[PDB]
Structures are given as structure tokens and as C-alpha cells.
Design a protein around this ligand. Sequence first.
Ligand code: MG
Ligand code: MG
Ligand code: MG
Ligand code: MG
Ligand code: MG
Ligand code: MG
Ligand code: MG
Ligand code: MG
Ligand code: MG
Ligand code: MG
Ligand code: MG
Ligand code: MG
Ligand code: MG
Ligand code: MG
Ligand code: MG
Ligand code: MG
Ligand code: MG
Ligand code: MG
Ligand code: MG
Ligand code: MG
Ligand code: MG
Ligand code: MG
Ligand code: MG
Ligand code: MG
Ligand code: MG
Ligand code: MG
Ligand code: MG
Ligand code: MG
Ligand code: MG
Ligand code: MG
Ligand code: MG
Ligand code: MG
Ligand code: MG
Ligand code: MG
Ligand code: MG
Ligand code: MG
Ligand code: MG
Ligand code: MG
Ligand code: MG
Lengths: 187, 147, 68, 103, 52, 51
Amino acid sequence: GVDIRHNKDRKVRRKEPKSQDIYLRLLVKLYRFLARRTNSTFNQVVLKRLFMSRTNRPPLSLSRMIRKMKLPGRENKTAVVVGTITDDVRVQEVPKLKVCALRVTSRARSRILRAGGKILTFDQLALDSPKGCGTVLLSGPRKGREVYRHFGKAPGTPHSHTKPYVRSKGRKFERARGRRASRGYKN
Amino acid sequence: PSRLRKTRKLRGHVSHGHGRIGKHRKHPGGRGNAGGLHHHRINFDKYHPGYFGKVGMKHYHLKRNQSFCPTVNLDKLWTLVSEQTRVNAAKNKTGAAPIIDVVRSGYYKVLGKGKLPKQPVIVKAKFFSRRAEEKIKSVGGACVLVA
Amino acid sequence: AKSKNHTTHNQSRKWHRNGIKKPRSQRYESLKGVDPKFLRNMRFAKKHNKKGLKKMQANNAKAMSARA
Amino acid sequence: APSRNGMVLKPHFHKDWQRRVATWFNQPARKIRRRKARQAKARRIAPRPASGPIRPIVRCPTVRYHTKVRAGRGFSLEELRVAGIHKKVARTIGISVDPRRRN
Amino acid sequence: LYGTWRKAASLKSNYNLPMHKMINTDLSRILKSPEIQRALRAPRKKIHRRVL
Amino acid sequence: PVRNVYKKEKARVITEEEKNFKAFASLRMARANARLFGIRAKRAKEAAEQD
RNA sequence: GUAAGAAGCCCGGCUCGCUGGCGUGGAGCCGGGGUGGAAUGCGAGUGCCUAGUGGGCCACUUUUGGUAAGCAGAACUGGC
RNA sequence: UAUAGGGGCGAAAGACUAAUCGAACCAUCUAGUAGCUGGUUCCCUCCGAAGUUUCCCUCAGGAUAGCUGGCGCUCUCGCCC
RNA sequence: CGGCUACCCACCCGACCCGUCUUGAAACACGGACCAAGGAGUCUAACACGUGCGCGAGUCGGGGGCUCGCACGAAAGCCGCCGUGGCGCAAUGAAGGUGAAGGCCGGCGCGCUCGCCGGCCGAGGUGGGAUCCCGAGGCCUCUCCAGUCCGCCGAGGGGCACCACCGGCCCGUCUCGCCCGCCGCGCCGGGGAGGUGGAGCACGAGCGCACGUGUUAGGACCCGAAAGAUGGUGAACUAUG
RNA sequence: AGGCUAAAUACCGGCACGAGACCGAUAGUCAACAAGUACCGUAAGGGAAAGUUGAAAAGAACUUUGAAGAGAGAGUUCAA
Ligand SMILES: [Mg+2]
Ligand SMILES: [Mg+2]
Ligand SMILES: [Mg+2]
Ligand SMILES: [Mg+2]
Ligand SMILES: [Mg+2]
Ligand SMILES: [Mg+2]
Ligand SMILES: [Mg+2]
Ligand SMILES: [Mg+2]
Ligand SMILES: [Mg+2]
Ligand SMILES: [Mg+2]
Ligand SMILES: [Mg+2]
Ligand SMILES: [Mg+2]
Ligand SMILES: [Mg+2]
Ligand SMILES: [Mg+2]
Ligand SMILES: [Mg+2]
Ligand SMILES: [Mg+2]
Ligand SMILES: [Mg+2]
Ligand SMILES: [Mg+2]
Ligand SMILES: [Mg+2]
Ligand SMILES: [Mg+2]
Ligand SMILES: [Mg+2]
Ligand SMILES: [Mg+2]
Ligand SMILES: [Mg+2]
Ligand SMILES: [Mg+2]
Ligand SMILES: [Mg+2]
Ligand SMILES: [Mg+2]
Ligand SMILES: [Mg+2]
Ligand SMILES: [Mg+2]
Ligand SMILES: [Mg+2]
Ligand SMILES: [Mg+2]
Ligand SMILES: [Mg+2]
Ligand SMILES: [Mg+2]
Ligand SMILES: [Mg+2]
Ligand SMILES: [Mg+2]
Ligand SMILES: [Mg+2]
Ligand SMILES: [Mg+2]
Ligand SMILES: [Mg+2]
Ligand SMILES: [Mg+2]
Ligand SMILES: [Mg+2]
């Protein structure tokens, strides 16, 4: 015998992207080449976010991608998004900014070009900035995904704040015992 | 997809993925939701708080038809009308304003939110929250009711 | 019909599989449960900090920069 | 029977449902039947239009739907008298007559 | 019947042509364009096998 | 038979009175007036009875 | 069980309806200054889903009932 | 020739009622029910337990924690501390 | 001449008969005489989660209509003045109902535990935080001047996701308070400041399809009872007239 | 508190009819065949087994043992 240490060396990482999509495989080939021939950690992070799944590439919204470029010092820097861009209905006025992202929706491309911008895909991003110089990587709201508002230690015991499963949010569906003090107990 | 199913891989094992000792027989605890008070209370409480009892007034013959009041926010309030209108009415034309009728779009009550641009408008709705009424009088437009 | 009633054997070896670590304890600990009079003090303290702490602290920052 | 954090299920299957299952398989055959019925109606009439009787302009009756407008049933004999035409003559002309409708 | 990417389809109502993922995709051309090969480390090709 | 008619209400200059008058409180005051339309009449009949 | 440092020190100032002889105490906030603070070993943190399990037994030592048991019942560690 | 199944008949044994009777036979409801026995069909690779807490007309069973596996994710390495 | 072999035989050593209930199986525990064929976790609904795809604050034609009567056509295609509707975009109350914007500066009213006015910005702040940017200085053959170019950087800047905390806002209640409004002056509305309950907001992430796993209802992994009900057939043996 | 009436709709019986990511004689209806037939029970009722020569019967003439079954020669055909 060798190791009284347990066996838990095999990390549960995602080596190959589980999708079968050809364009995503070609982007994986290119950015794996860049991450092993350039030694820039930007390529490492773009490669891992290309591996990453359908859930953990959540869609950026246009207003947040405006607010993170309105920060001091990021005017000329291109906002790079792994994931998709959704057009926002909230904000009115969009500045000139350059965005490199996968699969920008139709209205979002429309109002970016109406503002007068320029979008790019990752092949053009590689042909421009191989080390990703002057690029700001952005990320989507992972915890805003609605399934993450069911996850807690319980649905009710030390106040728990975590939305129990039920069919229809009305009266008479899960409101009576333990949700109010006059009926038994309260949490 | 029986070929991708777990069951085709699980052949050759004696208990077929349910233990030799436990032996999935028919219906161990009960059926459905048996024992809601008696012996599954540690699931029902701690996983469904509030499942037992009455709370409210009993309302007979309810229609989800009289209480129909959808909401619309001051964020969405512009894009009920085409953006050519807000551009032309915002291009310093005169004191005039466009009329946005949310009852045409199908929204009855205008709730308040943030970020209403300073461009004055006239909104017609069946109901108004005093938040949105303050926001419209702050940007300089007016509130109008209908019937 | 008699069975072994209660034991605690083979329990420590279960507990130390994943490890009996501490409860994390992050910075700025949870502030619930503290004296309500002190809490009513500290809330008005914070908002009037953020109210009046502009001008004289900016003066003192200029003064300490002029000194050093 | 229940488990971890999962929603309470009350399906309506205790009644012996597998006996009385009527299944849509004759749905394309009914679509072809109803096409042949409409084409047979068009050839069996004459110059008279398909969906022959005219229908009124009618507003829904619910705080929910009263903004909209609906093709009603008939022309509410007061209106048909203001049109200046007799009752069954309107049914022969192709004008829908519904005497219960009030104005 | 399907349009270009610039104008919408006229016969089919709401339908545009699809989005396009990689614009130019000759991977050999991209890797042997000078903008990448300016920023490459080096070809490291010594094998360095096991020494007894 | 549908031809759902669509009104425009194109453009108009904002005036006064309206934007000083048409507040939230109109609906609440009218709703409370409708809820208490009867009890005020009952107290009127009481004040007539008390002579 | 706790401690064996930057979440820590030290200085200076602002705010408080709390406290009150006192610009007093206590907290918070801001700005500034200097990380080399027992030994040894290691990659850690975190989320979801959920199977099987809910009949145990033996051994050193400590032990309860019994005359005693290859008896019944416990503790620490290992094994089956 | 009469009496038919919770019915008949019995000098009474709960006997007989078509080789069945302390409730006949045949079909249907019916694939009834079972916390209880028996079986549960190809290979290789990797990881790998529990027979314990609490509650239950619970003590041959279940829910709950604990143990397990899978899916990942967020950081750390490579170049006098 | 070489040859492993499911051929046969010799010899040495190891070698108890399989399946399962079981703490314990070779058991004097049960099932198996031998052989061929059949024989057991399927399908639907519903939910949860992970995964892949498309569209994206939308999405879905699954119900209809449209095309000439053509095998494959019970297909496929189209509708959009067929989006009616589902799910989501807004929660909260038992209900009547109500329903999420603040920050920075200038001024006034006693700047009074207090409200109003004017301008601008716009989802606050604290500690971490991948990445990005800037950069002292550092290094490339005679001495001067050179530019890209080269790479390490002490340190500093803005800071994604997310974590932890504080502050803010909505709704229900409770407490303390004064002011305003007037389709009509009232047991009428609206408002303020605190502490609490909420499945909340705090720039939205769903919807549809398919696959996997798990759970539940269904005959539901397969076989299994003593029973119960409905409706009928029997006195040819036997019992008694 | 009197009455009539097409349409759209249900249909595993019947009458024909067309197809099938269906089973291929221990399967598929119990019934691919003299199947509700043979058979069991007094009766209610229960209820099977059983497809395949060859292209064409060309089904082995004739001889020769044996009482015949059966055989040995011979012959048919691509094959007995
Ligand atoms: Mg080894
Ligand atoms: Mg191991
Ligand atoms: Mg195994
Ligand atoms: Mg089990
Ligand atoms: Mg036990
Ligand atoms: Mg279970
Ligand atoms: Mg129930
Ligand atoms: Mg049933
Ligand atoms: Mg399992
Ligand atoms: Mg468990
Ligand atoms: Mg057990
Ligand atoms: Mg000793
Ligand atoms: Mg013992
Ligand atoms: Mg014992
Ligand atoms: Mg009986
Ligand atoms: Mg007998
Ligand atoms: Mg069965
Ligand atoms: Mg049975
Ligand atoms: Mg138990
Ligand atoms: Mg694990
Ligand atoms: Mg057992
Ligand atoms: Mg035993
Ligand atoms: Mg054995
Ligand atoms: Mg045996
Ligand atoms: Mg035997
Ligand atoms: Mg077989
Ligand atoms: Mg999904
Ligand atoms: Mg709608
Ligand atoms: Mg009973
Ligand atoms: Mg009976
Ligand atoms: Mg009967
Ligand atoms: Mg007789
Ligand atoms: Mg009548
Ligand atoms: Mg009638
Ligand atoms: Mg009819
Ligand atoms: Mg055969
Ligand atoms: Mg058969
Ligand atoms: Mg033949
Ligand atoms: Mg042959």
C-alpha cells in the first residue's frame, strides 16, 4: 500500500466542451492555441469560458454593459463578453463602444449600429488583439438565474428567505401552518 | 432512447440498482402524500411550511375576470409607442407632448419605477400609483384618467 | 425481538471524512441581535457621517497633504 | 413516498383513466373532411359567398375585454328596422337576425 | 423568400437570416497571418525524454 | 367584420389645471366617497329625526 | 477550548438623537504610516442533484446486570 | 316432486349441499392488496459506503440528518518571501 | 523444423457447489436431474435539477384556417388585422386595496431630532476579488544620438462574476408624531420618523424543444395470497318431507 | 311548468376498404391448419396441439429375401 490519503485527485473540470457545435469547436481550437502560445491569462479565461456550459455563460444586458464601460478609464477599451448580448428596453441612449461577443441578438446589433458602433466576433478579436490588450472582460448575472432563489438551508426554519416550491401563488396554497403565529407556530 | 437509458447498462447486476437488502417492493411509505401529519412531518414541515390549515375569507364563485389589472412600468412606458415619436417630440419642437395610451397596448395600471427622461408626455390609464404620478409631474408631463 | 438500542461507535470516523472544519467567520460579522438602543444610535451615526463628513474631512485631507 | 425539496404532487389519475382515453389520431383526417365540407359547401351554394351571413360589430362584456371588438351574431331588430327592411327578408338577403339583442 | 442579412424576408413575415458565428474562418490563414505570429512565444520542440 | 379601429390623439400642448389637479388623490377620494355614500345618507336621516 | 498578527498595530481628524461634570465614554466613518511575526505538512473554498444505508459483530483497555457464558448492555480506537 | 348459498336441509356431528363446506361452484370487478419470501439477463475503467441522531400505533418499515457518487464553478501555481 | 492451441494423457502444488437472506454459508439453511426457446425497471402525465440547441424581454402554434384530387403527403410549408391564450416581465395583503430612485452641489425656512426650492448625475457604499490599464527602475558588441522593438516590474489606478456586511425602496402590522390636499370640508383622503413579518426591488432571463437522473399516480420491475362485491348454474351422490 | 329541428360531434359491433420504423408459428386474436373444432364438466362454463417434399409427383417400375412390416439391388431428379 502507498497512500493512506484518500483518492480525490481527479478534478471535475471540463476538458472538452460538451457541445457538438462546429463553430464552438473551431473557437476552442484557436483559443487553446493562443492560451498555450501567448502566455496571457486573458486567453486562459476566454478559453475556460468557451468550455463553460449553457447555464454559466449567462446573457449580458446592454444597460449593464454600458454601465461597466462608463467607469473611469475604459472608453477606448473594448468590452469583451463571452456569452450573448440582449438588447435592453430600459435605457434610451447608447454610446459608441466596441463589443466583441458571441451571438448578439438582432435588435441589439440594430441599436448598436444605430449608435454607430462596431461589433466583432472572436476571430476578428484574435486578429486584432491576440494578448487581448485594451480589452475589458465582462460577466453575466449568474445568481440572478431564478433557480438560485430556491437554494438555501431550508425553505422555512431560521427564516430561510428561500421561496418554497408550489403551484400557484395564491391563498390556500402553503400559507397556514408555520407561516403565521395564530396557526401553530412561526418558523 | 433505450440505448442511452441507464437500464440497458444495468444488466448483469443482480439487484438492478436498488440494493439487495432494501429490495424496492411496491410502496414502502404509502402512496402519494401519506402521513402528512403522522410520519412524514419532518419532510412536510422543513420542506413545505404552511401546508395544513385555513387562512382567509372564503370567496365563492370567483372570477379571474373582474380583478384583471395588469401593470406597466415607467421603464416600459416608452416602448408602447414607436421611438420615432419620442425622437421627434424630443427634438426641441415646441411645448407640445405626445399622448401614450396604455389601454391600447392592454395595460390598465401604471406603476412607478425609476429613470423617466425629462421629455414631457401625457399618459392615459385607468389607475395610477402616486409614485408614477409624482414622476410624471416631476418630468413635467401630466396625468390623465379614462373610463 | 430485541435490538441494539443506542451507540456512538463508528461516528468519529464518519465525522472526520470531509473534516470537522470551522464555521468560516468572514469579515464584518452579522450585526443582528445587538442592543437596539445602540443600533438606533449607530444608524443615525452612519447617515450623518455620510451627510456632514464631506467638507471638514476634505479640509483635513488637504491639511495633512500640505504637512506631508 | 416523498423525498428532498420537491413540489407537492396531486395528479388526477386514481380514476381508471386508461379505459376512457380518446386520442387525436384522426385529426388530419378531420382536417381533410372539413376542407372537403367547405369546398362542397362552396360548390353547392351558388354565387352566394362562403361564410354567407354578415355579422355585426360587437364589444365584449368584461372589465377585461371591453376595449376590444368582436364579430357578433345578429343585427338586433331595432337596428334592422332602422335599416328599413323586413325581418325574414333579411334572412333571405343574408343579413343575420338575432332578436334577443338589445341596444 | 429568405432575404439577405441586410433586408428582411418579404414572403416569410418575421424571419431574418441567422446570425453568423465566426466571420472568416480559415484557421490556417488566421494562424499564419502576421498579427498572431508577432505575439507567439517560440516553437519549443526538444523532447527531453526519461534519463536513466 | 373586426377592423379594430385605432385612434391617434396625435399631439397637444400641455396646459395647466390638469397637471396641477389630476393627482392620485382623486381616485382615493372618489373610492371612499363611493364606499361611504350610504352611511352619510343614514346620518342625514338621523339628524332629521333628532329634530 | 482559545491565542500564536495586515481583518493586525499606531497616528490624526469628522458624525452621533446613545452615554454624560468635562471635545466624557463607546461605536461608526475618513485619511496617513511601517507585513520578516512558533514547528511541520499540504492546493483550498463553494453550490446543486441523489443512490444505497436506517437487523450488526469481534478484539486491547475501561466498564454496568449476572455465579458465568461463544450472555445481555456502554465508552475510545482498529478490524470483519 | 319441493326446498339454492349467508341460503337450503340437519334424531345436532358446524355434518351434508356433485371427490370442495366453520359459508358450494362458474365468470367478472381483477394484472385486486401486501411494510412479506423468490428472481431480477453484455464487458471494461474509475470512485466507493452504512447498519448511527430525531420523529412516527414506529421496533422486519419510512421521513430526516450523517456517510457516497456525479455535475461543475470560483480562486491558487509555474519566474529576503 | 516451429506451433499456441477449448484434443487427450501423465506429474507437482494449490484447490469444498453455485444463487441469496444473513454479523456469519462448504454447511446437517433453502432452490437447482439434464437440455433448447420464452422470461423481468417499459409507457404516459406531472414536477425538480443538470445538459445541448434556437430565439431573446420576450417566447410558443401544440387549436384552427390557407395550397390541385398525386406514392413517400396522417409528411412538409405558410398565417401575425389568427398571440385569444399559456409561462415570464411585480410583489404583497385574509381582504377592501396598495404597489419598488436615489446620489452630488447651491439656497431658504430657528439647517430645529425639520421640510421646501434650484441645477447636474444616476441604481449607493465598505472589504476581498480573475482580468485590464499606468509605471519608477532593470537589461540587449567602441564611444554620442536614435526609434519601433524586447521583457521583468516594486508600486499605483478603474474593477466583472460572486461572497460578507451596512445603507436605501415597496407591501402588511405595531409605536410615536405633526402637516398638506378639497367634484366638496367628513367617524374624507394624502403624507412623515422609527422596530418588525414577506416566497420582494436594488438594470431584467425566461420560453420552447430534446436528452439524462430522481420522485409520485397509474396493473408500473415480474409472480404470489386467506378475503369482498355483482350476476348466474346445480338436490344424478347426500340431508328431509 | 306544451312541442319540433340539419350541422360541427362519439363509434373496439357490422359492411367492404387502404396503409404500417408492428409479430413472424412457444410471437401475433385462443383460432396462419376441418377453431370456438377435437375434448373436460350434469351445467353455468372451461378450451388445445397442429405451417414448410420437390421446379415438376417425376411418390421409387422391375428384380430379389422375408408370412408381412422391413430390406438389398435397380430407377426419379441437381439432391433422396
Ligand atoms: Mg502499489
Ligand atoms: Mg479505493
Ligand atoms: Mg457492483
Ligand atoms: Mg428501499
Ligand atoms: Mg438496530
Ligand atoms: Mg425513499
Ligand atoms: Mg394534499
Ligand atoms: Mg384503481
Ligand atoms: Mg438508486
Ligand atoms: Mg438519505
Ligand atoms: Mg431493515
Ligand atoms: Mg497496562
Ligand atoms: Mg456483546
Ligand atoms: Mg444477541
Ligand atoms: Mg357468501
Ligand atoms: Mg362433499
Ligand atoms: Mg403484478
Ligand atoms: Mg391475483
Ligand atoms: Mg425504527
Ligand atoms: Mg462530493
Ligand atoms: Mg428478511
Ligand atoms: Mg441468525
Ligand atoms: Mg453461498
Ligand atoms: Mg440449498
Ligand atoms: Mg431439490
Ligand atoms: Mg433466451
Ligand atoms: Mg433546462
Ligand atoms: Mg394577451
Ligand atoms: Mg373489508
Ligand atoms: Mg358474498
Ligand atoms: Mg346473489
Ligand atoms: Mg335425487
Ligand atoms: Mg319551450
Ligand atoms: Mg321544451
Ligand atoms: Mg347532429
Ligand atoms: Mg419453427
Ligand atoms: Mg395461441
Ligand atoms: Mg411443389
Ligand atoms: Mg445442392
